[PDB]
């Protein structure tokens, strides 16, 4: 097959999550990249894109991004989707929002636009009110819906996908949250990444997006659940994409796509049509505490309901030859979420027994909200304890991560942190493998229990770009952090 990854991909989806194909996840075919003429990469907004210059004062990434979502609304002529993270957009996030949609009004079009945020238990309607106050004439074009949501209280669940898709044609995603504090307005800024297709994998996020927005719209009611506000007289609307844009998108290149998410917890309890069974491995050290239930590691319904987890694990187990992972933390805090995803580890270990070679960034510890762990000693003893499951014992186990693993946190220029003296953050939720197939979107690889979104892209051109304009930068100035890295011989 031309795309061996992907097959493995969707076969295992197909297993865990039957019923969701078409609205949770889906694969397509016939997308593309959505760089620019002069820039072929520029698909991949990375955020801020300053390499090797602990001033960031050239942020190219940063640049590309707020015109690529500027460029997406203003060519929209009939509905923009955007999902986040609350707080709502502000700053120059906002402001490109806002030149967006007067450019798309003053080329005539009468557009539908929904925005919603996930939140922690008058937001949405002040929210509504500043966006319309900064439209002017052209919110006379608009149909608006705001609405910020949590699924569960007890399950720390609500929206963390960050998706912008305009008229199903388009779409935006990744882990970049709009938050004109943390990535813009900072001589620290985070590192961060989304993606630009164009294509029916638009198409698919916009089901996803029905398929939030038609549980938000149902619990509209439940002020524990749901503050919803609108432009005029306008109702909820929990299926703008399919009663607005084309069931299939369509065409614009050749890139095969699996779109995935997850429910998270609240949303919906089971797949009834899964008949999904698992292996479950045994825990040990990942349940901190004993009353926890752990959706991650032991709740087979909850896979059935998050096909990312089981597509990152299954994209892992794809590799034949190496894995870059790229993320701000493996591992969670608990309480209240369990230490770490059993299976993703064993899946690593797994890869790293055969000599596939594995590369794990992770944000500095100097951090600790853009980190959960005190040591990178907390990623390498796990990776080692289940090595040691495969390989005979620890000794053994040592000998095989010592031989196959980089694992080191972020740096984006010489500097051990930013000249402004604080650390370096990082927040892309990235995996790439074999330079062929990687995964951009906001699904953290740490326990997490969210509604979260990506692709899973295979095309080698566009992974070899990966590589060179990030992945490759990365490594250049990350790699003086190592406690372990096969291609020098450290091993500490
Ligand atoms: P996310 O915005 O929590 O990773």
Redesign the pocket.
Same mark, same amino acid.
């Given at each position: 097959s031309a795309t061996p990854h992907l097959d493995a991909v969707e076969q295992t989806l197909r297993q865990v999550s039957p019923g969701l194909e078409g609205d949770v996840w889906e694969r397509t075919s016939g997308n593309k990249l959505d760089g620019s003429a002069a820039d072929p990469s520029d698909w991949l907004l990375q955020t801020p894109g300053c390499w090797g210059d602990d001033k960031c004062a050239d942020r190219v990434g940063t640049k590309r991004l707020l015109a690529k979502m500027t460029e997406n609304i203003g060519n929209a002529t009939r509905t923009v989707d955007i999902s986040t993270?609350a707080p709502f957009p502000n700053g120059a996030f906002q402001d490109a929002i806002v030149a967006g949609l007067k450019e798309s009004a003053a080329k005539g079009n009468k557009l539908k636009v929904r925005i919603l945020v996930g939140a922690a238990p008058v937001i949405p309607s002040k929210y509504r009110d500043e966006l319309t106050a900064k439209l002017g004439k052209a919110a006379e074009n608009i149909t608006l819906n705001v609405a910020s949501m949590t699924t569960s209280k007890t399950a720390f669940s609500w929206n963390?996908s $960050?998706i912008l898709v305009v008229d199903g044609q388009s779409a935006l995603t990744g882990?970049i *949250?709009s938050w004109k504090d943390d990535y813009l307005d900072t001589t620290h800024p985070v590192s961060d990444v989304d993606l630009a297709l164009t294509g029916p994998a638009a198409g698919s996020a916009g089901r996803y997006l029905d398929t939030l927005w038609t549980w938000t719209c149902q619990n509209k009611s439940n002020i524990a659940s749901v503050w919803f506000a609108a432009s005029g007289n306008a109702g909820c609307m929990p299926t703008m994409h399919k009663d607005t844009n084309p069931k299939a998108s369509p065409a614009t290149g050749n890139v095969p796509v699996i779109a995935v998410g997850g429910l998270g917890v609240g949303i919906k309890d089971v797949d009834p049509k899964s008949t999904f069974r698992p292996d479950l491995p045994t825990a040990s050290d990942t349940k901190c505490v004993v009353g926890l239930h752990d959706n991650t590691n032991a709740d087979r319904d909850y896979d059935t309901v998050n096909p990312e987890e089981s597509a990152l694990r299954a994209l892992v187990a794809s590799a034949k030859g190496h894995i870059e992972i790229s993320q701000?933390d493996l591992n969670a805090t608990c309480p209240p979420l369990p230490r770490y995803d059993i299976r993703l580890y064993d899946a690593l270990a797994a890869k790293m027994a055969a000599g596939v070679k594995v590369r794990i960034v992770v944000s500095d510890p100097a951090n600790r909200g853009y980190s959960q762990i005190k040591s990178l000693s907390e990623i390498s003893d796990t990776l080692r304890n289940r090595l040691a499951n495969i390989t005979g014992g620890q000794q053994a186990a040592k000998t095989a991560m010592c031989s196959n693993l980089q694992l080191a946190t972020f740096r984006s220029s010489p500097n051990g942190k930013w000249a402004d003296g604080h650390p370096y953050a990082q927040?892309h $939720?990235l995996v790439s493998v074999d330079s062929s197939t990687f995964y951009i979107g #906001?699904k *953290?690889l740490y326990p #997490?229990w969210?509604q979260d979104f990506g692709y899973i892209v295979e095309s080698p051109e566009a992974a070899k770009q990966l590589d060179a304009k990030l992945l490759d930068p990365q490594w250049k100035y990350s790699q003086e952090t190592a406690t372990v890295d096969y291609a020098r011989g450290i091993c500490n």
């Open positions: 993270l963390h $960050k882990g *949250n701000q927040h $939720k #906001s *953290n #997490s969210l």
